Amino acid sequence: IDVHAYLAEFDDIPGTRVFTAQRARKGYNLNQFAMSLMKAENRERFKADESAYLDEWNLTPAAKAAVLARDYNAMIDEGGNVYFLSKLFSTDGKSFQFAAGSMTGMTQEEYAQMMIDGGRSPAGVRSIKGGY
């Protein structure tokens, strides 16, 4: 019933950035650029010259760098959404598992071993103020 209270709670989850309106508004351009890669021709053009391609999307200097550096954590900080961005690492030839692990700082090998072992435990990573 209270949109502000509803939204405030998401700030208490560690290592998570819920895709709210505020983020959507910020990453509008970055997410729309990513959407453009659903077209084979656009992918070819992007690949030809990435920097030039990005210039037609009015990204903020930060967002542009994040893309060229394929830093998905930085891209999410700029308002990008994982599902929109999947178009980017997809044209790169990477999987969802690759992108996710790349954001944990773990090596592709360790991340894979962790998933094999049961994944990351929620214990301790649920609340920032509650410590559980």
Binding site: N81, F96, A100, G101, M115, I116, G118, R120, P122
Partner: protein, 298 residues
């Protein structure tokens, strides 16, 4: 005119890629595909094949970009093309819909006070075609008609569990008022627990997932009260897809019989879940084994 069964399943793209690269039998994927075998066999049996499947899933920024974000949509088109999500269109047959039943449900839902968004043209991404590949294999053409039903769970806020649950019952009412005696299915796809983003990516909560499955069967009304924040906290930010399961559940009566349940960890970044539910009243005989849990961690 009849919702005979409710099925839930994962719809992650990795399952689709496994099939494509013929790696579905390797050491990693084999256990997963082994779990769907009982379903593939069951459904293909005489009289189990549905006429239509109302497939509930969330568009993954494929059919909808940042310019149009519908909460509830219904594909009333005659045909749907697989979407190109960066690798080129999924190499699976075109999805054939059922405009008559689709338009019927659309009209009923709006009269029943749901602010539907009618889609007469839309590509269906992996959320819709992967479950098809998992349950119907690789036919030259899908064995039945499919009515895509995209739900928004990408941009906040997504509908509430309570709204989703109520929507399912409305869909059943709509199906039941359709003049033709069709065998209709309602599949809730997505999940289970997982986080695709940040330092917390890789999160799995079998406790949460297993409890969700349990309550969804025995007490969906209470489960539909669980707030968004809890899914995000316990099942990972992307685990919120599970709300879509309440839509499938709401379309089934109070008493259902679980014919099969498969839970496995891991399946890419997720904990995979799949089950067959049926109204207790007309439920067939459970499968043997009726419950299975795979994974090095289980």
């Amino acid at each position: 005119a009849r919702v005979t069964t409710g099925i839930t399943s994962s719809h992650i793209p990795a399952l689709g890629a496994a099939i494509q690269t013929g790696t579905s039998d390797n050491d990693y994927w084999g256990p997963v595909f082994k779990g769907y075998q009982p379903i593939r066999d069951w459904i293909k049996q005489p009289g189990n094949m549905p006429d239509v499947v109302i497939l509930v899933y969330n568009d993954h920024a494929s059919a909808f970009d940042m310019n149009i974000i519908p909460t509830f949509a219904i594909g009333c088109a005659e045909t749907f093309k697989p979407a190109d999500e960066g690798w080129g269109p999924r190499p699976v047959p075109d999805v054939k819909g059922h405009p008559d039943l689709a338009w019927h449900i659309a009209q009923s839902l709006i009269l029943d006070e749901f602010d539907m968004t009618i889609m007469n043209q839309m590509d269906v991404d992996h959320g819709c075609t992967v479950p098809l590949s998992m349950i119907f294999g690789e036919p030259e053409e899908w064995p039945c008609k499919v009515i895509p039903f995209p739900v928004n769970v990408v941009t906040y806020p997504p509908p509430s569990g309570k709204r989703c649950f109520a929507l399912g019952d409305s869909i059943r009412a709509a199906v039941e008022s359709f003049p033709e005696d069709l065998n209709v299915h309602v599949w809730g796809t997505g999940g289970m627990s997982h986080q695709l983003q940040g330092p917390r990516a890789g999160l799995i909560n079998k406790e949460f997932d297993l409890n969700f499955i349990d309550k969804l069967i025995s007490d969906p009304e209470e489960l539909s009260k669980m707030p968004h924040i809890q899914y995000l906290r316990e099942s990972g930010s992307e685990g919120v897809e599970l709300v879509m399961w309440l839509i499938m559940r709401g379309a089934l009566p109070e008493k259902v019989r679980d014919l099969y349940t498969f839970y496995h960890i891991p399946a890419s970044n997720t904990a995979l879940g799949a089950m067959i539910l049926q109204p207790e009243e007309t439920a067939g005989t459970p499968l043997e084994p009726r419950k299975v849990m795979s994974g090095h961690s289980l």
